[PDB]
Structure formats: structure tokens, C-alpha cells
Amino acid sequence: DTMKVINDPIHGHIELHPLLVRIIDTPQFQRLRYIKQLGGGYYVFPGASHNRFEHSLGVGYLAGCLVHALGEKQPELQISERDVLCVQIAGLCRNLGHGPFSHMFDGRFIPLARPEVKWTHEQGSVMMFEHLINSNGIKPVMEQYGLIPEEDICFIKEQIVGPLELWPYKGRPENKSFLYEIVSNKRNGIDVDKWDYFARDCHHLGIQNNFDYKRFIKFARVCEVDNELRICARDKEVGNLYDMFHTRNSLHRRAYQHKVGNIIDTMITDAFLKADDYIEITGAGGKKYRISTAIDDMEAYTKLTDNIFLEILYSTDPKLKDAREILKQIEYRNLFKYVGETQPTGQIKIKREDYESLPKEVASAKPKVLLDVKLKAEDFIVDVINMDYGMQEKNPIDHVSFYCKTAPNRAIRITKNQVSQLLPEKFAEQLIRVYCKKVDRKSLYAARQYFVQWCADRNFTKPQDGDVIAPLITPQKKEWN
Amino acid sequence: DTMKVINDPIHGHIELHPLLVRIIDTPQFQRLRYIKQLGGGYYVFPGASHNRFEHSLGVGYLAGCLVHALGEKQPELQISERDVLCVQIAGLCRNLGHGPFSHMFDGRFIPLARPEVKWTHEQGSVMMFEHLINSNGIKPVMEQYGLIPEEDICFIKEQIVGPLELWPYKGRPENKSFLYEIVSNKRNGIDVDKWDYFARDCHHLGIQNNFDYKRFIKFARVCEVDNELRICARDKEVGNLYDMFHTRNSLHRRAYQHKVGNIIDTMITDAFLKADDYIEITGAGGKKYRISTAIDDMEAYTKLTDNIFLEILYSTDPKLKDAREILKQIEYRNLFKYVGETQPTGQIKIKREDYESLPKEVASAKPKVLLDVKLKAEDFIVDVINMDYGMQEKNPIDHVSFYCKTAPNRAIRITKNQVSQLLPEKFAEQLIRVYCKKVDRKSLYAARQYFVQWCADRNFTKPQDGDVIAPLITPQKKEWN
Amino acid sequence: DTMKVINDPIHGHIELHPLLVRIIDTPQFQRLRYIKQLGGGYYVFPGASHNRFEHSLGVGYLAGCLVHALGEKQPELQISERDVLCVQIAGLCRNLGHGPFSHMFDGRFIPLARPEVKWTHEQGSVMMFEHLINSNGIKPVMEQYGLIPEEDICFIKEQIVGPLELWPYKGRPENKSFLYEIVSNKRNGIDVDKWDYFARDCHHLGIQNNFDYKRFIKFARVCEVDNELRICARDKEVGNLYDMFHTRNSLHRRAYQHKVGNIIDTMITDAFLKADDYIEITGAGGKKYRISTAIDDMEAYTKLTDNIFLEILYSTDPKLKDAREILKQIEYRNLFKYVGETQPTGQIKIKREDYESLPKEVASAKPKVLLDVKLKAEDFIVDVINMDYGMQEKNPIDHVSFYCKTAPNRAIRITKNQVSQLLPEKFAEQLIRVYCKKVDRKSLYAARQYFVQWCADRNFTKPQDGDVIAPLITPQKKEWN
Amino acid sequence: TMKVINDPIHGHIELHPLLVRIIDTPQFQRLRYIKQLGGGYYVFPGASHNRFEHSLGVGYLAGCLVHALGEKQPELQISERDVLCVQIAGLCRNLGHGPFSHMFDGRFIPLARPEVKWTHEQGSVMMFEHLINSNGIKPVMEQYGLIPEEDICFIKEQIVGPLELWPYKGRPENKSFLYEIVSNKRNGIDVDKWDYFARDCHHLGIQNNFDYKRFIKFARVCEVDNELRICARDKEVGNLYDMFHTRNSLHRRAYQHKVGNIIDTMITDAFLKADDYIEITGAGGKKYRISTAIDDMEAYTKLTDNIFLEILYSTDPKLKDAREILKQIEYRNLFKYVGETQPTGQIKIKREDYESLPKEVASAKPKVLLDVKLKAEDFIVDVINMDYGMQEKNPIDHVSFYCKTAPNRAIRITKNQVSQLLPEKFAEQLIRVYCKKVDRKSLYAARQYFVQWCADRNFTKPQDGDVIAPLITPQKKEWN
Ligand SMILES: Nc1nc2c(ncn2[C@H]2C[C@H](O)[C@@H](COP(=O)(O)OP(=O)(O)OP(=O)(O)O)O2)c(=O)[nH]1
Ligand SMILES: Nc1nc2c(ncn2[C@H]2C[C@H](O)[C@@H](COP(=O)(O)OP(=O)(O)OP(=O)(O)O)O2)c(=O)[nH]1
Numbered sequence A, B, C: 001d002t003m004k005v006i007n008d009p010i011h012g013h014i015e016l017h018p019l020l021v022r023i024i025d026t027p028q029f030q031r032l033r034y035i036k037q038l039g040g041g042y043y044v045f046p047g048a049s050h051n052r053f054e055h056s057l058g059v060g061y062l063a064g065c066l067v068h069a070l071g072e073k074q075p076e077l078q079i080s081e082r083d084v085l086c087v088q089i090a091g092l093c094r095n096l097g098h099g100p101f102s103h104m105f106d107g108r109f110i111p112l113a114r115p116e117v118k119w120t121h122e123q124g125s126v127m128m129f130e131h132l133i134n135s136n137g138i139k140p141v142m143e144q145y146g147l148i149p150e151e152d153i154c155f156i157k158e159q160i161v162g163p164l165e166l167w168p169y170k171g172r173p174e175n176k177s178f179l180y181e182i183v184s185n186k187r188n189g190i191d192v193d194k195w196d197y198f199a200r201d202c203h204h205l206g207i208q209n210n211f212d213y214k215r216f217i218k219f220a221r222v223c224e225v226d227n228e229l230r231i232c233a234r235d236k237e238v239g240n241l242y243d244m245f246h247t248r249n250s251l252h253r254r255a256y257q258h259k260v261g262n263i264i265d266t267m268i269t270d271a272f273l274k275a276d277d278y279i280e281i282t283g284a285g286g287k288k289y290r291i292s293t294a295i296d297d298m299e300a301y302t303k304l305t306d307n308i309f310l311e312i313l314y315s316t317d318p319k320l321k322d323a324r325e326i327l328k329q330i331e332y333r334n335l336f337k338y339v340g341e342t343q344p345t346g347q348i349k350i351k352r353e354d355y356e357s358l359p360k361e362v363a364s365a366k367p368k369v370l371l372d373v374k375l376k377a378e379d380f381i382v383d384v385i386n387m388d389y390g391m392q393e394k395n396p397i398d399h400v401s402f403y404c405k406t407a408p409n410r411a412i413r414i415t416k417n418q419v420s421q422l423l424p425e426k427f428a429e430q431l432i433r434v435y436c437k438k439v440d441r442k443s444l445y446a447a448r449q450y451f452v453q454w455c456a457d458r459n460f461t462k463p464q465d466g467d468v469i470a471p472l473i474t475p476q477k478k479e480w481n
Numbered sequence D: 001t002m003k004v005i006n007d008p009i010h011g012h013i014e015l016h017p018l019l020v021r022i023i024d025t026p027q028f029q030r031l032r033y034i035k036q037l038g039g040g041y042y043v044f045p046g047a048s049h050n051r052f053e054h055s056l057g058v059g060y061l062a063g064c065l066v067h068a069l070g071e072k073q074p075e076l077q078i079s080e081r082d083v084l085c086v087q088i089a090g091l092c093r094n095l096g097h098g099p100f101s102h103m104f105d106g107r108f109i110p111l112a113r114p115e116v117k118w119t120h121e122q123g124s125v126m127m128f129e130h131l132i133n134s135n136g137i138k139p140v141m142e143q144y145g146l147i148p149e150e151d152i153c154f155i156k157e158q159i160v161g162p163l164e165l166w167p168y169k170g171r172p173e174n175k176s177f178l179y180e181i182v183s184n185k186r187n188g189i190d191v192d193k194w195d196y197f198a199r200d201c202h203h204l205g206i207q208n209n210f211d212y213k214r215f216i217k218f219a220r221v222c223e224v225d226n227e228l229r230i231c232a233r234d235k236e237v238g239n240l241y242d243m244f245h246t247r248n249s250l251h252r253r254a255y256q257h258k259v260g261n262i263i264d265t266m267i268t269d270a271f272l273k274a275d276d277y278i279e280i281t282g283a284g285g286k287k288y289r290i291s292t293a294i295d296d297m298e299a300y301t302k303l304t305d306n307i308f309l310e311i312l313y314s315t316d317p318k319l320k321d322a323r324e325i326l327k328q329i330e331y332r333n334l335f336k337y338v339g340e341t342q343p344t345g346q347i348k349i350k351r352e353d354y355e356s357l358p359k360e361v362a363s364a365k366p367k368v369l370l371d372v373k374l375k376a377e378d379f380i381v382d383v384i385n386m387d388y389g390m391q392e393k394n395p396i397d398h399v400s401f402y403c404k405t406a407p408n409r410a411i412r413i414t415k416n417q418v419s420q421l422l423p424e425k426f427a428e429q430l431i432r433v434y435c436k437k438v439d440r441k442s443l444y445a446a447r448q449y450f451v452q453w454c455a456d457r458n459f460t461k462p463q464d465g466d467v468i469a470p471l472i473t474p475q476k477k478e479w480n
């Protein structure tokens, strides 16, 4: 058995070591071909047909690239082929945990269907990885290629999800700390996963990516930082680093958080919730699971893909009527109507426990206008979106180590004032989108009045179209004028 | 209802008239989101995740582009916006008839399941279009936008499939003849459908497209050709036109006819054949249809997509075991092994009615070599592939009209000798690919011996790896030496 | 006589009306083939070989595109073919005024050699366009294609430079105000010139551009804003607008203001200053001019291009030795050394009249470090760069009007807080770069010491490599530690 | 230390300090002032790229190929010395080009000095020697582990071939494959082509079909005839044919563009009219001409596209006629394209007869009334040999292949084993005819003469034959 070459639109010709090939050629990995990277985004950006599978290949490739470059520049790090293979495997497998329509599953469906559990795609990925190894006798192949399965499986899982619970890692010692910054960077979020999705998502969406991962790779080194060996970027790349996150933000504003994409995710979630009692997924020992419980059995989860959508759409079962209908409404493009967007002012933040209270608040608004219809709380959808640089309120560049030309081995820090006064003063904010489930002109008008009045009452920002959609409300709010 | 703008990775921002929007937002059209453009190609080129849907959008867009250019350069053709809309609709809808995994369904599955029928994706597109129209109340929307449904529906269908059986079309008369050359060009095959798939497939496969359709559009006029107003190209462009077909050939060589992608379409077709007795698809009136018979009822065929693959894969029904296993072997990458490629010589033309006899012939070869194992007819797959410029043995450029800069309204002919002595001297050929279903090393060596001796016997071309896989057989053939 | 097609790597096939071709095929215009768009940038980014000529073609093309789109969507604006042609000509001709190495000439050389005249590339463009018209018999051609030369040349000039001095323009009445917002937008800087240079400079530099001008064009309309018709953008696009300027800033940071690119422009400028007494340029009537005086005779300025560089480089004249010498140092890559970059803190700005005193300040600093070399003012270069969004301190998005989907003829304003809290809080800043004209190690060490001490003394920002290049200076400053 | 350079084609290119020392000389930086495609820029405005960036690209790709080969096959004993030398060879194999590139070696020199056998290869060797010697590079070379005598020999050999049974002195037979990288004398598959495909395509605004990276990945070193040579994987054969196809296409669309060619022609004419008056100072303060600067590398260093502008900006009467020609180019008053034909049959047009062809066209007798008479002096006849780089040969016949079942074993693949749709021939000629008289009467007349001349010699029927000469084509029964 030998290496295989794969041609990828983003990276060109990727070499895949036989062990990696063995891992890829499993039902657990091949499953990723049937899950859309951007989920509902595909129904807004037609080019976004790409799946988690090709992305996974890309991430494995890039992890390989960065670890190899680091090894070639700095022999003294003692990076082994075993290290390279473990980092490649981690990169390759860090998307195994995703569910139907990707972020629709972990971001919307699971939190609603199973609020008592704290599910993440990372946990899902380690579980699916374990299932993959155990179902396909991978351990002897790992040993055959020089790996030490106990240590190395620990290492890979640690790369994916973090310490499994003072150096908290068992897979590798502190002198290899930098290896943990490659596939999933918990320290500052700068990892190859982002690079691949920037390039790939851009390629498919019809948006241009402005981040140069190659340049970053060429200017990266390993330096000592607080008794670990960590990845450091050349000082003059700091601007580019800020720009990387800017790029991420932009991709979220244009595509990932598109109003219509989000509402389509929401409707699919509604359909899944209404179908959860009736769809059966047959897992280990012939036991039967729901969509909401497939996460409890990896054999079942292996069979849980975008297919579900179609299974609901093509169904005849009367019990599934209500689910089916919603999906049908998606096909006819009879979607919930976007009412508007606003933001909190002051220091005010909206917390997850208070999400449920928002539709009620909106309907309880009393706009001083002639209305024809009256709207209820259940007619309203309030979608709140946390936009940040990946570390909540923190500036992630404050967690980046740099090096200078004249002392390549000395790590330094760079503050925001040292770069540009035109950079963000803040690194997190919330966007509030309001939609209406009633799609008639009268109802839409009413919902617009309710929404603007609500915005005024809570001292939120004036909606961009406010004077147009509610010319009777906005002048009452002096804070807007 | 206003026009909508859609962002496409290939074409950028596409404007869609409200009528086209109404047509697109139906189950019949949205169905195409669930059928891979290149089918099994995705399992070889991971970037090739694109579906028939977005391709259809691109075809409609380019149809619009070309008819608009023709109109704006020559107002004397009296091209109406009704004509523009009908050409756009035809462009949009000429992929509606495709089935699961695209060509796998009409090039392999249907011919083997229903050999009595003569089914084409064109006819399917016609039927599905009629179904879409009737099921969605489109006729009065058409009327709302100035269309005359009888004549215009006729025109659209004629653009898709040709004369519905002197001037043979009922939709438009001779003075609009050129309109029939835009969406599906039966005259020489130069149409916008090709242009979109060149660009799109290249974008996803990771091959670069060297054909410039924008340039062709720029240089296109319409001149008089035997009392017909036909589309003519600028003389200068003849080389490019030749290369257009060359490009097609290359794309077929590199991707569409890739040995493994083809063997994978073959395995999926086998599994569809074995699942054939047991999968049910609900058609009109609850009547149970069928993978091989869903084509008889459009309401059912609307539900026939790539999902079938998954339905088989995820099944637990014992009757389906046989199909299931096959799909599973695709996931484990246990495919039929490629043995080789050869070509006929001289005047030999392998006919359709001999394909079935082919595996027996290889199996019945006597190579004068020691074999640990002998193999049977069953063990063999012989795939015959007809590569051509789209008009059998004919030069399609001989069916193209050109114009000269000094007299733009005067159509002329250009012959191959007026172009280059480096052009093809043939415009059709046959490729013979052989695989063995027995994948062990011993069996494969055997298969290679059998195969080469078969090539020497039928006086086919020597396989490229002939002197390495069968060294005790190649010195028998003097033509090969 | 007839239109021509030109194939451009950015825009593809560009159609040029015969009048435009007439204008283009003159010495005054073809001159632009011999002036690098990015000047000294080519000596850092080898792909940036592009000249002002191709950029001019692109700008004319885009101006045409925007005016055409506006006319097509809004026939009630009464945009004539004459308007379209005049906008195209202004677009084609707004780069005529550039001198050798573009921004090196108008940004560095002229301010030093002719500080009494207030020269701009705009004014130079007007003069050169006048010279083009008058030297090439263009007026009768204009008349031949339906233009009225007094009015229309006035219009074109006004598009290039602004009012030649209520409605201040004389080329077109108030109802055509929007037409002045296309080629050079003095209201907010959003124009087609930027769009072309974004795409082109990116294509050649090897940086991907983030901005989608086609999308902008699709979402642009004309609306009435305070008794004026202006180009308005869809509200939804506000984000992208901010990002446009972000892009500009980034392009300036990565490429246009690259420290080395700038130092090479500076050295070329020095050479030109040292060559000015001895270079002769034959102007009107055999009359001779200097590099510094070529601008007061258009006939001489026509022959003033990048060629000068080579003329100096290949000279044998003893009197040119020194100038030649400098150019030679550029070839051996013996450049002035970059010492560092810093910024003022808080609110303080560096006034222009103070620039000249800066190198003396650096040389006057007293770093507590033992040095063998003492440097003087003449050895220091202090380059002050104003980075902004094109309107000094003002947010240009505050000078954009938008429209909403439900009332697209109604113009509205959108404020920064209505968009995002992550946007810039300021729109102007200054970067101070310091170089040393002595290039030996010891001189560079000293220069670094003086520079960091100077930064501390003026309470400027701590340089990014401060602790590395000057470990004995930086701990003195508590604000830095 | 190393330097990184960002290139739009290859992205970030790392440059070893020795390469940097070589690049930062007047002899190398010279290439910034010579257009890759010359007159092509006056037709494809995106084609502003110069030989400098192309050279960087070639050096980079040479490095890539050698590194890949080494890493896949350690048994080859490819040293860092070998890598650096192959890189230098890649970087420096364009040093010999003159003003407007091929215009200078394809057109000017053959007319200015018809006795010399000038090639850009030899010029590259001479210029490389001049660079090394003028910039104290040999000590730097030994400073980075190279042995100047052997290695400079090796580099020159990579550039021009055997300087004077294994003909090479720079490296023995077990390193033969190294000579197949920068300039492949054997089959023309080299990294120089790869770079110009991608770069020229990027600037022209036409897309590249060929995937060099794939080739690099499916490339090996296998033993052939006591030589270790680069072999491609069998399945790549189609692609290889396509490579040459792409080349042909690029010549068809861009490099041999009728107007591009006529502009190179006009510039050549202007340089010829300027030759006696343009002084270029060389070694010793000696003065040279455009035509003789190739005899002194110091003067040649200063011979770039700038000549054009020096002629265009001149005032002296002696240069007027040169100057005027350039001015016509600016006014787009170009010589007029009359038409194109090809010779039929196995027959070919020898370079010996090229000078006679303009007389022939003016000697034709079209049976039509013509206002004007044209002289041989009024016609330009430009003949262009289109081929796969080995005259009449099929370069794929000179490629070695390997199969995945035994990848250390060279094999051959014939055209018949591949496809019936491939070219049946691998060389042909194109004849373009122009008229220096641009008035309408003259152009009509020229079209008559030309079509009649095509008829008289049984040349191929011009595509617009019926349109431009309707009275002429009927006599030729074969044209219908
Ligand atoms: N750019 C490009 N990619 C290709 C071409 N042919 C195949 N590919 C892609 C498809 C795959 O993702 C990858 C590998 O395909 P290959 O045909 O080279 O390997 P394959 O396993 O099919 O054959 P093999 O086992 O080596 O005999 O490259 C080609 O001619 N050009
Ligand atoms: N290139 C690009 N495409 C975008 C951007 N935002 C959305 N798109 C894509 C998605 C769609 O394919 C197409 C239209 O999206 P829009 O957001 O402009 O239309 P939408 O119906 O959502 O809003 P609307 O009804 O007009 O208020 O453009 C963007 O910022 N850049």
C-alpha cells in the first residue's frame, strides 16, 4: 500500500500517506460528504455546495504544511514523522463531529432539543474518532507506521478538544507545546482550520479571500515563551494578523450570518424538532434513536447526515405532515419575513437565558399607530448573534507572540496602540434580527411598527430603514435624532 | 414581486426576472440541488460537489447574455423581451430531466433496467417542465409578463428537445431561427450549456478552463444562411472554436471518463439494479413507483434523486443487503480493480450489440502463461467509451457559419485546411477499459495476462504498461514491435 | 472609423467606441505606457510591472459600465449617448497628468524642486488633455459623433479636476449632478478609478482584492438629496462600503507605503534632483526644459516618463556622475537603511511646516549608550505618512446616501453606530518612518539608539522592535513598560 | 540571509543569499527593462511584464523540481550544491535577451548582422560570465560551498548545452537528469516553459490549461541508456501532448498575433534605420551600436527597450526616419494586414526564398482593373514555423515513462497507444502578407495581388477570399 494524490481546487495536489488513506476510507469519515459546510447558506449562495469532507482534507493538508515548515526551518525542535502524522490525523479528523447542515445542528437544533446537555462539535469529533479507530482496526496500522497508539491517540484527541483532564497535556510534553497551536488553537484562534475555510468558503461563495496563509507559514517560527516552545509570528505581520480576524468577521457578516440563510437554518431546525418523534435512526445492536438522541450512539450518528432533510421531504407518513410542510414552504420560498436588525447600546449585553423573553417583549410593545392586525409573541422570531474575534471581549492579538528580524529567537509582545489607531476599539458585539412568521403585507407592517417601538423602548440602535418602515415611530425617539 | 439578484462563483451577480424566480422556486426545479453534476466524479475529485441546480442557473444566465448581445448589436432582428424570457426559461430548464448521479442514470442505469425504452435527459426535461408548469400555476404568471403560453411553451420545449414530431418548428418561424441555436444547438453543438459546464466543472475539479465564451459572444452576429437567419462567428475565431471541442475532449479525458469515477458509477448502478426490486417511491395518487419506473410518472421522478444512494446505504432491510454491501464497499474503497485500456485499429468499430459478448472474450483468452488461478466471464467488466466532437464522425466546424470584418452580413464557410495542418484528422474514436471484480493480487495478474493476450488477438493497440504487466506476451505481437 | 475590442486581464473584453480609439492613439495618451502605476513598488513587488496606460483603459471601461447601468435602470434620468461618451473620455483621461514613477513625481519630487507651485496630477491631467485635443485634431471627431466641444470638453475637464472656478459646474446642469460622481468623486471618494486600481494593483502585486465593484454597480441608483440628484447605494451595502475603504487602507499598508518602496522612490527623487541641472528636454519650438520645468510645457512633459531614470543611469557625462551614482546604488541594492516606525500618541498631530525639522531632532537626541560613531541631521530621513479614508478626519460614509428596498427613490443617511461597534473610531492617523543614509552596521546601531531615544523624548509610541534594537533605552520610559 | 519575494504567479519565493547577490547586479536588474513579449504589449495591454520577474519564476521552479526529485529519491545523491547550481541556471537563462525580447533575436540581429549566429542562449552565457566577473561572485560561491570552476561550467552547460560519449564536464552521467530541468535539449519539457505559460497567461488575460505541479508530483528519475533521466508516469502522456498543444495555442493567439508581429517588424525597421547613429558606450569608453553591442557585454548591459524611447524622443535629422516610424506606431498608422495562407502538400518554404516572396506577390496579375500598381517594396511577407519544438519530430517520442507496477523501469509510448485525435503532423508554416501602403485603393489592390498569388501557387484559400477578392477566387476550381 502506498500514498495517494488528490486534486483539490483550493490546494492543488495533496499527498496522502497510507495511514491517512486508511482513516479516510471509512464510513465514519466518508459520512462527511453528506453534510454541507455552510448548511442553509447553500440556499442563498448557490456556489456553496461544498461539504465537510473536502474541508477536512484541506485542514489535514494545511496542518501537514505548517508542521513540516516548522520542522524544516528549525531542526532543533526535534519534530518526528510520528508528530507530523499525528498532527495530520488531528487536522483531518477535527470535523468528524459535525451534524446535519453543520452549524444548524450544534448551534440551533441540539441546544433546543437537548438543553440539558452541553454538546460541541469538538466532543462529537473525539467520539466519532474513537468509533472510527475501533470499528476499522486502525491501531495496528498506526503501529505499522511507527505510531504509539496510547500516547498518540491521546495526542490527537487533545489537539481536537483540548486537555481531557501546570502542563495539562499528556499526549506531548511542554517542549512540543507549539504542536497544539496548529489544528485547533485554543490560545488565540490562529489555526489551519480557519485558513482552509477562508480559502474554500470564499472559492465557493463567490467572495474573495484577502488572507495569505502561505505568507504566515513562511514567517512563523518557534520561540520560548514562559517555559513552553510556542509559535511566534514575525513582528511586521501583526497588521495582517488583525486583518485575518477582520476577514473572519466579514465572512460572518456577508455569508455565515446572512439574514435569509439564518432564517432557513431556523425553519429546518423547526422541521427537525417537529419530526424528532417519528424519524428513527438504527444504531448499534439494532436499537432505535431519534435525531436528538443519535449523538448518544456513534453508529447511529454515523448515519445522521443532511439525508434527514430529504427523508422528511419525501415522506408519506401522516405523523410527519407538519414537518414536511415546513420543508415544503422552504422549497416554495415561502419563508418567514425579515423585519429588521438592531443593536444594544451602552454596556448592555443580552444573555442566553433571556433569549426566550424577547419575542414576548416585541409583541408587548405599544406603537402609537393605526394597526389592522394584532400580532402575538409566537408570531415573532428574535435571533441574537454574538460577533467577536473568537475570544469573547478579548483582543486575540494580545495573545500572540512575535519575533524580530534582529533576534529571531526572542519572543516579544505588541500592543494595539503600537499598530494603528484605525483598528477596532471593541472586539465583541451583538446583532439582533427580528423576523415575523405571518407573511401578509398588513402583518408585516404591524410587525415593523412593533419592532421599531421595541427598539425605541429598550434604547437599541435605530434600524437602518427606520424612517421608511415606521415614519410615525422614529421621531418620538430623540436619541435617534 | 421584483427581480432577485443571485451571486454565483462563476458568473458573479445574476439578475433573475420575477417569472424566472417563480419558476425556480418549485419542487421540480429545487430538486436539482440534490443531483451531482458529475456523479461518481465527486468520489475522485473532492471539489466536484456541485449540483445540477447552480449549473441550470448559469445556463439560463448565459442564454440571456447571448440573446441580449445579439439583440443590442442588431435591432433589425426584432428580438422581443418575450423571446429573451423564453430563451432564458429554456436555458434554466434544460437540466430538469436528469436523474440520480446525472449521467450514471441515463448512460448506465436506465439502459440496463429498461432496455425497451429510449430515454434521454432531454425528454425528461420536457416532461418535468410540463409537470412544473401544470403543478405550479405558471401559465397565468407567464401571461402576466406578456408571454403567450401555447406558442411560448411550445418554443421552450422545442429549444430543449427539438422538433416535436420544410421548417419543422412551431414555436418560432425561420426569421428567428438563430434563437434555436442558443440553449441546445442541434446544428453543431456550440451552445451556452457547454460554456457554463466548462467554466463551472473546471472551477470545482481544479482544472483550468481555456475557452473564452465572453469573447465568442462579443464576436457573434447573425447572418443569412440558405434563407435562414443563423448565428455566425467572426472568421478569426475558427481556431478557438476548434479548441472549444478540444477542451471538451480534454475534460472527458481528465475527469468525466476517469477510470475510477466510471467504475464507481458502475458499482452504484449495480447496487441500484439489486435494490431495484425493493425501494418504493410514491407517485401520483399513492401509486407505488420504482427506481427504474419513476420516469413514467413525473410526481414520482420529482422525488428520485441522489438520496436513493443514502436510502440504500442506511437501510436495514435484508432484501436490500445485496445492494447495501456494494455501496459499503465503495465507502471502504474496495473497488473493482483497473486492468487496462486499449483501442481498436484500422476500420474496427465495436458496436453496441457486442458489449455484452466482450467479457466472455477476455475470459476466453489463452495466453500461454502459468496461472495459479483461471477467471470467468463474470469477473470482467469491459467498458466501451465513444469519444467524439459531438457529431459522430463529423467535423462540427464544417457546420459553422462565419463572417468577415469587411462584410459583416455575409456568411461564409471555413474548411479545416484553411486553419491548420495540426488539427485532428479524425473526430471520433473508441476507448476500451477493462476491470476485474476479483481484487486479490493473483487474480489481478491473471486478469492482466488474459487482457493483454485479448488485445493481441483482436489486434487492438498495445496497452501503455504492456511491457511491464505482461512481459511474456508482448513479444508475440510484431505490430507492437 | 469603427469600434475596437481590447482584451484586459482584469475586465476581459473591453469595447472602445471609435472616438475613444481616436483619443487613445496619440502621443499624449500612449505616453502612459512608459510610467509605472506603483513606481518604486515594482522594485519590491516584481509582479507590479503595470503602467498608467492599462489602468486608464480600465477606468474608462468602468466609468462606461456605471453610467450605462444607471441609464438602463433609470431611463427617467435622460442619460444620453453623449453623456456616456463624455464620462468614458473623462475616465480614460484622468491619469494623463502623472509623471515619472507616478506618485514619486507628484508626491516627492515636485514638492521639493518646485515648492512655489501647487501642482497636482488632476491639473496636469487637464493641461495634458487640452494639449491632446489641440495637438491631435480631436474636436471635429467629437462633433462627428454628436458631441458639442465647448460644453463637453468643459464637462470632461470638470470631471477630472472639479469646477474651473449654487451649482458650480458649467459642463452639465443640476439634473445631471450624479454624473460628476463617477470618475472622480469629490463628495466621498467612491469612484471607478479606485475600483480599477483595487482590482489591477491586486492582480499584479499578488494580493487578493476584497471589494466587489460589480455588486456595488448592481445596487446603485440615483435619488434626490437636497435638491441634487446623487448616486445612492442600497442600505444593505453600508458594511461593504466601510470595507471598501478598509481595503484601500490595507493596500496602502502592505504595498503603496511599503518602507522599502518608499525609500527607493526617495532615492530616485534624490537622483532626479541631482540630475536636474544637466538633463535637457526639448519642448515647444526646439526650446529646452528641465525635469523640474517639464510641467510648464506640455510638449516637453509629453516626453517626460520613466525613461529619465534610464537616461540618468546610462549617462557618461561627468556632470551626471553623482545622480548616476545614486541610481547605481539602487541596482546593487545599497539602499538607505530603515531604522524604524512610530506614531504620535493621544491627540497630537505633526504639522507639515515641522517635517523639515525632524532629522535634526533625531540627531539631537541623547541616548545613554556608548557609541563610536556620531550621526548628524543630514544622515537621517524622517518620512511622515498620513493614512486616512480620503477625507482627512471625516468619515466618508457620513457623506454617502442610501436607499431602502420599500422606498428606493427615497434617500437616507446611515451613521457609524447603526452599523457596527467594531469599525474604526478615527479615520486619520500618521506613521513616522525613520531611515539612516549611512549603511554600515555601527551607523545602523547608533541610528537605532538615536531613533528610540527620540521616540521616548517626543512621547511617541514604542516601536515594535524597541526592546530588541534598543534594550538600553526602552526601560527608561514607564509609559512603554 | 534569505529574502522572500512575493510573486503573483508562485506566491512567496524564498531566495538563498547567493541568489540574492546574483540578482542585485546591473547585469540582472537590466532585465527589468526588457518586455517579455515585446510588441505583444501593444496588442494585449496586460502584457507589461518583463524578463526579470520571469527569470525569478524560472529559478524558483528549477529549485522546486530538483528539490522534489531529491526528496522522493535520496539514492540520487542530489546535493545542496546541485540545488543552488540548478537554481542559478534557472535564474540566469534569460540574461541574453535584447530589446523587446524575440524581436531582437528573431528579427533585428538576423538582418543587422546576417553573418553571426547569435542566440539568446549564447548571450545568456556571455552575460552570466560578465556578471560573475564584474561583481566578485566566485568568492561568494565558494563561501556557500560551491566550487566555481566545475559549477560555473555546469551552470553554463545547463543554459546553452555542451560547451565544446558523455559531452558534459559540469556533472557526470549519474547526474544527467539535472540537465533536463532548466533547458531540456532532449524534448523541450523544462520549467522555463512552465513559468512562461502561467505568467504570460496571467498577463495576457487568457487562461493556462497546463498543470506543472501535477507533472512535478508524477515525475521520477529512471535509468535509460547508461543515463539517469527524468521519466513521467505513463498516464500523464495525454497531458504532455496537451502541454505542447497549449504552447501552440499561445503562439496562435498571442505570440504570433498579426498586429503584434507587424509592430515588432516596424520597431525592427526603426532600429535598423537608427543603427548608425545610436551610440552605446562599452568597455574602455569605446562606443558601440545597437547591432554591435552584443560584442561587448558592458555595452549590452545598457541595451534595453529604452532604445525605443531614445529614438522616439530624439531631435536629430539623422534619426528622423527612425523616429517617424516609431511615431506612426503611436498614431496606430500601422502597415496593413492583407491576409494569411499556408503551403499545401509536403512542400515547404525555405528561409532562402523568404526575400523573394514579396517580389512574387507584386508580380501576380489579377484580372481586375486596378487604379494603382504596387511594387515589391510595398509588401511584407512574414513566414512563421509553427511546431512542437523539435522541427518535424514528435517530442513525446523522446519522453521516458514509468508504470506504477514497476516505477524504476523506463518505457516508451507511441502516438497510436494514446489517441487517434492527436495531430498527424507536428510542424507547419504560416504565411502572412502585409501592405505598407495604407490608403484604401492600395489595400484593395493588395488584396487582389495576394489572392491571385495564393491561387498561382496553389496555396490555401484565404478565409475571407470570396469577400476581399470576389473576382479572383472563381478561377480556382478547388476553392469551388
Ligand atoms: N489536474 C489533474 N488532476 C487529475 C488528472 N487526472 C486525475 N486527476 C485527479 C483526480 C484525483 O483527485 C487525483 C488523482 O488521480 P489519478 O488518476 O492520478 O490516480 P489514480 O488512482 O486514478 O490512478 P493510479 O492508481 O495512480 O493508477 O488527481 C489530470 O489529468 N489533471
Ligand atoms: N459578493 C457578495 N454577495 C452577497 C453579499 N451579500 C449577499 N450576497 C449574495 C447572496 C445572494 O446570492 C445574493 C443576494 O443577496 P442579498 O442579501 O443582496 O438579497 P436579499 O434577498 O437577502 O436581500 P433583499 O431582499 O434585497 O433586502 O448576493 C455580499 O456582501 N457580497
Ligand SMILES: Nc1nc2c(ncn2[C@H]2C[C@H](O)[C@@H](COP(=O)(O)OP(=O)(O)OP(=O)(O)O)O2)c(=O)[nH]1
Pocket: B212, B215, B236, B240, B405, C005, C006, C007, C008, D043, D044, D045, D205, D206, D253, D254, D259
Ligand atoms: N482571449 C483572447 N484574446 C485575444 C485573442 N486574440 C486576440 N486577442 C486579444 C488581443 C486584443 O487585445 C484583442 C483584440 O484582438 P483582435 O485580434 O481580435 O483584433 P484585431 O484588430 O487584431 O483584428 P481585426 O481588426 O478585428 O481583424 O483581443 C484570443 O484568441 N483570445
Ligand SMILES: Nc1nc2c(ncn2[C@H]2C[C@H](O)[C@@H](COP(=O)(O)OP(=O)(O)OP(=O)(O)O)O2)c(=O)[nH]1
Pocket: A212, A215, A240, A405, C044, C045, C046, C206, C207, C254, C255, C258, C260, D004, D005, D006, D007
Ligand atoms: N502577500 C503579501 N506580500 C507582502 C506583504 N508585505 C510585503 N509583501 C511582499 C513584498 C516583497 O515582495 C515580499 C517581501 O517583503 P517584506 O516586507 O516581507 O520584506 P522586507 O525586506 O521589506 O522587510 P524585512 O527586511 O524582512 O524586515 O513580500 C503583505 O502584507 N502581503
Ligand SMILES: [Mg+2]
Pocket: C184, C189, C193
Ligand atoms: Mg481619487
